[PDB]
C-alpha cells in the first residue's frame, strides 16, 4: 500500500498500486474542531471505496465530500 500523485508515498500492505488523481484523496478523514454532526464522504485508500464520516462543520481537509457521487468524481478514474 503505497500511492503516488506526482512524487510518491509509502504505507504498510499490498494490493496493486493507485496513482491518485489528487494527493488529498489519501488524507485521513478529519472531523475538525467544531461540534456539529454533518454526514460527509471521503475516499478510503485501503478499501478503495468512498465512505461516510461525521464532519464537525469547520476546518478539516480536502478529502471531504457532500455526496458519494461528488467523491467518486474527485478520487476515482476513469
Amino acid at each position: 500500500s503505497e500511492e503516488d500523485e506526482e512524487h510518491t508515498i509509502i504505507t504498510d500492505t499490498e494490493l496493486p498500486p493507485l496513482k491518485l488523481m489528487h494527493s488529498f484523496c489519501a488524507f485521513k478523514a478529519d472531523d475538525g474542531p467544531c461540534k456539529a454532526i454533518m454526514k460527509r464522504f471521503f475516499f478510503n485508500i485501503f478499501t478503495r471505496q468512498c465512505e461516510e464520516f461525521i464532519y464537525g462543520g469547520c476546518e478539516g481537509n480536502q478529502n471531504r465530500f457532500e455526496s458519494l457521487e461528488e467523491c467518486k468524481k474527485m478520487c476515482t478514474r476513469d
Binding site: 485521513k28 472531523d31 471521503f42 485508500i45
Partner: peptide, 20 residues
Amino acid sequence: FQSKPNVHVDGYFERLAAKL
C-alpha cells in the same frame, strides 16, 4: 496520510462519542 486501519485523524472516535 491514511495508514492501515487508521483512516481517521487522532481522536475521531472519542470526539464522535461525545457528539452522539
